[PDB]
Amino acid sequence: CDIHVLWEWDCFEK
Amino acid sequence: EVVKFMDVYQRSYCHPIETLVDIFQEYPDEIEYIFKPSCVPLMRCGGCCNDEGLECVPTEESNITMQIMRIKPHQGQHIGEMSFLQHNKCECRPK
Amino acid sequence: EVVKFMDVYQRSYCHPIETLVDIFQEYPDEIEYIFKPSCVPLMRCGGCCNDEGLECVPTEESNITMQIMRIKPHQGQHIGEMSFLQHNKCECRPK
Ligand SMILES: [N]
Protein backbone atom coordinates (compact mmCIF):
# COMPACT_ATOMS: atom_id res chain seq x y z
CA CYS A 1 0.00 0.00 0.00
CA ASP A 2 2.25 2.77 -1.29
CA ILE A 3 1.51 6.11 0.36
CA HIS A 4 1.77 8.13 -2.89
CA VAL A 5 -1.09 6.27 -4.62
CA LEU A 6 -4.86 6.00 -4.17
CA TRP A 7 -5.60 3.15 -1.77
CA GLU A 8 -8.00 0.23 -1.94
CA TRP A 9 -9.94 -1.01 1.09
CA ASP A 10 -7.43 -3.39 2.67
CA CYS A 11 -4.93 -0.53 3.08
CA PHE A 12 -7.26 1.00 5.69
CA GLU A 13 -8.54 -2.01 7.63
CA LYS A 14 -5.09 -3.63 7.81
CA GLU B 1 -28.51 8.40 3.58
CA VAL B 2 -24.84 7.90 4.53
CA VAL B 3 -22.02 8.11 1.99
CA LYS B 4 -19.80 5.06 2.34
CA PHE B 5 -16.13 5.47 3.19
CA MET B 6 -14.61 4.31 -0.10
CA ASP B 7 -16.86 6.62 -2.12
CA VAL B 8 -15.80 9.65 -0.06
CA TYR B 9 -12.11 8.75 0.02
CA GLN B 10 -11.95 8.17 -3.74
CA ARG B 11 -14.02 11.24 -4.62
CA SER B 12 -11.77 13.50 -2.51
CA TYR B 13 -8.37 12.08 -3.49
CA CYS B 14 -5.96 14.37 -5.38
CA HIS B 15 -7.28 14.85 -8.93
CA PRO B 16 -8.04 17.64 -11.44
CA ILE B 17 -11.30 19.38 -10.55
CA GLU B 18 -13.12 22.26 -12.21
CA THR B 19 -12.26 25.26 -10.04
CA LEU B 20 -13.68 28.77 -10.40
CA VAL B 21 -10.83 31.30 -10.34
CA ASP B 22 -10.99 35.09 -10.26
CA ILE B 23 -8.99 36.55 -13.13
CA PHE B 24 -7.27 38.92 -10.70
CA GLN B 25 -6.11 35.81 -8.83
CA GLU B 26 -4.15 34.65 -11.87
CA TYR B 27 -3.08 38.13 -13.04
CA PRO B 28 -2.79 40.48 -10.04
CA ASP B 29 -1.18 43.24 -12.12
CA GLU B 30 -4.49 43.74 -13.99
CA ILE B 31 -6.55 44.67 -10.91
CA GLU B 32 -6.96 48.12 -12.50
CA TYR B 33 -9.45 46.84 -15.11
CA ILE B 34 -12.87 45.17 -15.12
CA PHE B 35 -13.45 41.76 -16.72
CA LYS B 36 -16.66 39.98 -17.70
CA PRO B 37 -16.99 37.30 -16.54
CA SER B 38 -14.79 38.25 -13.58
CA CYS B 39 -14.03 34.56 -12.93
CA VAL B 40 -13.38 31.57 -15.18
CA PRO B 41 -13.75 27.78 -14.80
CA LEU B 42 -10.38 26.00 -14.79
CA MET B 43 -9.24 22.43 -14.19
CA ARG B 44 -6.87 22.62 -11.22
CA CYS B 45 -5.45 19.97 -8.92
CA GLY B 46 -7.58 19.61 -5.81
CA GLY B 47 -8.30 17.25 -2.97
CA CYS B 48 -6.22 15.63 -0.28
CA CYS B 49 -3.43 13.06 -0.09
CA ASN B 50 -2.95 10.09 2.22
CA ASP B 51 -0.56 12.09 4.43
CA GLU B 52 0.05 15.71 5.36
CA GLY B 53 3.66 15.34 4.20
CA LEU B 54 2.41 14.93 0.63
CA GLU B 55 0.76 17.53 -1.59
CA CYS B 56 -1.41 17.43 -4.71
CA VAL B 57 0.69 18.87 -7.55
CA PRO B 58 0.21 18.85 -11.35
CA THR B 59 2.21 16.48 -13.53
CA GLU B 60 0.73 17.68 -16.84
CA GLU B 61 -0.30 21.25 -17.66
CA SER B 62 -1.66 23.11 -20.67
CA ASN B 63 -3.09 26.46 -21.74
CA ILE B 64 -6.77 27.06 -22.47
CA THR B 65 -8.02 30.13 -24.35
CA MET B 66 -11.34 31.82 -23.58
CA GLN B 67 -13.38 34.72 -24.95
CA ILE B 68 -13.34 37.38 -22.23
CA MET B 69 -14.64 40.95 -22.12
CA ARG B 70 -12.55 43.78 -20.65
CA ILE B 71 -13.34 47.47 -20.27
CA LYS B 72 -11.43 50.46 -18.90
CA PRO B 73 -13.33 53.33 -17.24
CA HIS B 74 -15.09 55.66 -19.67
CA GLN B 75 -13.49 53.73 -22.54
CA GLY B 76 -14.59 51.30 -25.22
CA GLN B 77 -15.75 47.75 -24.61
CA HIS B 78 -13.24 45.09 -25.70
CA ILE B 79 -13.70 41.38 -26.33
CA GLY B 80 -10.71 39.14 -26.96
CA GLU B 81 -8.80 35.99 -26.10
CA MET B 82 -7.23 35.30 -22.70
CA SER B 83 -5.11 32.25 -21.86
CA PHE B 84 -5.18 30.44 -18.52
CA LEU B 85 -3.14 27.57 -17.11
CA GLN B 86 -4.98 24.26 -16.70
CA HIS B 87 -3.95 21.10 -14.85
CA ASN B 88 -4.41 17.87 -16.81
CA LYS B 89 -2.95 15.37 -14.32
CA CYS B 90 -2.15 15.40 -10.61
CA GLU B 91 -0.12 13.28 -8.22
CA CYS B 92 0.64 13.20 -4.51
CA ARG B 93 4.32 14.09 -4.06
CA PRO B 94 6.61 15.18 -1.22
CA LYS B 95 6.36 18.91 -0.54
CA GLU C 1 -9.76 25.88 -29.55
CA VAL C 2 -11.44 28.87 -27.88
CA VAL C 3 -14.19 28.79 -25.26
CA LYS C 4 -16.88 31.18 -26.45
CA PHE C 5 -17.99 34.07 -24.26
CA MET C 6 -21.50 32.84 -23.48
CA ASP C 7 -20.07 29.44 -22.55
CA VAL C 8 -17.54 30.99 -20.16
CA TYR C 9 -20.14 33.37 -18.72
CA GLN C 10 -22.77 30.71 -18.00
CA ARG C 11 -20.34 28.16 -16.55
CA SER C 12 -18.67 30.71 -14.24
CA TYR C 13 -21.81 32.44 -12.95
CA CYS C 14 -22.78 32.02 -9.28
CA HIS C 15 -24.09 28.48 -8.64
CA PRO C 16 -23.50 25.37 -6.47
CA ILE C 17 -20.32 23.52 -7.48
CA GLU C 18 -18.53 20.46 -6.12
CA THR C 19 -15.96 21.98 -3.75
CA LEU C 20 -13.29 20.07 -1.84
CA VAL C 21 -13.31 21.18 1.80
CA ASP C 22 -10.93 20.32 4.63
CA ILE C 23 -12.69 18.62 7.53
CA PHE C 24 -10.86 20.78 10.08
CA GLN C 25 -12.53 23.88 8.62
CA GLU C 26 -15.92 22.25 9.21
CA TYR C 27 -15.20 20.71 12.65
CA PRO C 28 -13.01 23.27 14.46
CA ASP C 29 -13.65 21.70 17.88
CA GLU C 30 -11.98 18.49 16.59
CA ILE C 31 -8.67 19.92 15.34
CA GLU C 32 -6.98 17.43 17.68
CA TYR C 33 -7.96 14.54 15.40
CA ILE C 34 -6.45 13.10 12.25
CA PHE C 35 -9.14 12.37 9.67
CA LYS C 36 -9.05 10.07 6.65
CA PRO C 37 -9.82 11.35 4.11
CA SER C 38 -8.71 14.75 5.42
CA CYS C 39 -11.04 16.53 2.96
CA VAL C 40 -14.54 15.89 1.63
CA PRO C 41 -16.42 16.88 -1.56
CA LEU C 42 -19.34 19.23 -0.89
CA MET C 43 -21.74 21.31 -2.96
CA ARG C 44 -20.99 24.96 -2.19
CA CYS C 45 -21.74 28.28 -3.85
CA GLY C 46 -18.98 29.34 -6.22
CA GLY C 47 -18.36 31.61 -9.16
CA CYS C 48 -18.80 35.31 -9.74
CA CYS C 49 -21.65 37.79 -10.01
CA ASN C 50 -19.89 40.13 -12.48
CA ASP C 51 -20.52 43.18 -10.29
CA GLU C 52 -18.38 44.27 -7.34
CA GLY C 53 -21.57 45.31 -5.55
CA LEU C 54 -22.81 41.71 -5.44
CA GLU C 55 -21.61 38.46 -3.89
CA CYS C 56 -22.56 34.81 -4.37
CA VAL C 57 -24.29 33.50 -1.23
CA PRO C 58 -26.34 30.37 -0.41
CA THR C 59 -30.11 30.74 -0.24
CA GLU C 60 -30.93 27.08 0.49
CA GLU C 61 -28.95 24.47 2.42
CA SER C 62 -29.13 20.85 3.56
CA ASN C 63 -27.09 18.18 5.35
CA ILE C 64 -25.14 15.19 4.09
CA THR C 65 -23.57 12.49 6.27
CA MET C 66 -20.39 10.62 5.36
CA GLN C 67 -18.28 7.80 6.79
CA ILE C 68 -14.95 9.28 7.95
CA MET C 69 -12.02 7.60 9.69
CA ARG C 70 -10.93 9.27 12.94
CA ILE C 71 -8.01 8.83 15.34
CA LYS C 72 -6.43 10.82 18.15
CA PRO C 73 -3.73 10.18 20.76
CA HIS C 74 -4.52 7.63 23.46
CA GLN C 75 -7.14 6.22 21.07
CA GLY C 76 -7.33 3.77 18.19
CA GLN C 77 -8.59 4.02 14.63
CA HIS C 78 -12.34 4.66 14.55
CA ILE C 79 -14.83 5.04 11.71
CA GLY C 80 -17.76 7.36 12.30
CA GLU C 81 -20.51 9.36 10.65
CA MET C 82 -19.94 13.10 10.21
CA SER C 83 -22.52 15.56 8.87
CA PHE C 84 -21.65 18.43 6.55
CA LEU C 85 -23.47 21.50 5.25
CA GLN C 86 -24.31 21.68 1.55
CA HIS C 87 -25.64 24.48 -0.66
CA ASN C 88 -28.63 23.63 -2.87
CA LYS C 89 -29.28 27.09 -4.34
CA CYS C 90 -27.24 30.27 -4.76
CA GLU C 91 -28.11 33.79 -5.84
CA CYS C 92 -26.28 37.05 -6.40
CA ARG C 93 -27.16 39.60 -3.71
CA PRO C 94 -25.77 42.97 -2.56
CA LYS C 95 -22.70 42.83 -0.31
N1 LIG D 1 -2.72 -3.15 7.85
Residue numbers in the entry:
A (entry chain P): 1 to 14
B (entry chain W), C (entry chain V): 13 to 107
Copy out sentences from the published article reporting this entry, exactly as the authors wrote them:
In the present work, we focus on a class of monocyclic disulfide‐containing 19 amino acid peptides targeting the Vascular Endothelial Growth Factor‐A, the main pro‐angiogenic factor in Human. Around 950 Å2 of accessible surface area (ASA) was buried at the peptide‐VEGF interface, that overlapped with the VEGF receptor 1 domain 2 (VEGFR1‐d2)‐binding site. Although only lactam‐bridged ExxxK, DxxxK and KxxxD induced the formation of stable helix in the unbound state, all peptides of the series were helically folded when bound to VEGF.
However, the NMR structure calculations did not converge into a single conformation. The backbone RMSD of the 20 lowest energy NMR structures, compared to the co‐crystal structures of bicyclic peptides and VEGF (see below), indicated that the bicyclic 2 c and 3 c were significantly closer to the folded structures than were the other peptides. Helical folds were observed in most structures for 2 c and 3 c, resulting in a single α‐helical cluster for a RMSD cutoff of 1.2 Å. However, in our data, the stabilization of α‐helix by the lactam bridge directly improved the affinity but did not correlate with an entropy gain: the affinity of 4 c was slightly decreased despite an entropy gain, and the binding of peptide 2 c to VEGF exhibited a less favorable entropy variation than peptide 2, despite the high helicity of unbound peptide 2 c and improved affinity. An explanation could be a difference in ΔS°solv between peptides 2 c and 2, but the ΔCp of both peptides did not evidence any significant variation in the desolvation process upon binding to VEGF. Moreover, the apparent inconsistency of entropy changes in peptides 2/2 c likely results from differences in vibrational entropy due to the cyclization constraints.
